[PDB]
Amino acid sequence: HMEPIPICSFCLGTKEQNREKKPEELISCADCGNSGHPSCLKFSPELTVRVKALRWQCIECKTCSSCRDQGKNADNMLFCDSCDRGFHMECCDPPLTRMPKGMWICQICRPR
């Protein structure tokens, strides 16, 4: 993993200062080192704990966990609400006819 950048990309704060100027540990991208406070990333406490256990990729580094295509910058993917892994629409299982309004949970989190 790339050496983590010790500040949050969104608020500039270190682990000592989130947006409320309170201490909060950073989540860091394994590929580029970009970091964010979970609160700045808008991750729930449950998502935060899971992501800290995984090799997390930031929004720019994220590749599809099914096909792992390098892809193009213009491509889109869903982000799992339980683990934050990314999946192309065409790579989701079960297949989706449309984007869910609420939470979406990937096939790694809930095999089905």
């Binding site: 889109n76 869903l78 982000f79 984007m99 869910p100 979406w104």
Partner: peptide
């Protein structure tokens, strides 16, 4: 749901 291009 969240996507790369809406985030």
């Amino acid at each position: 749901a969240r996507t790369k291009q809406t985030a």
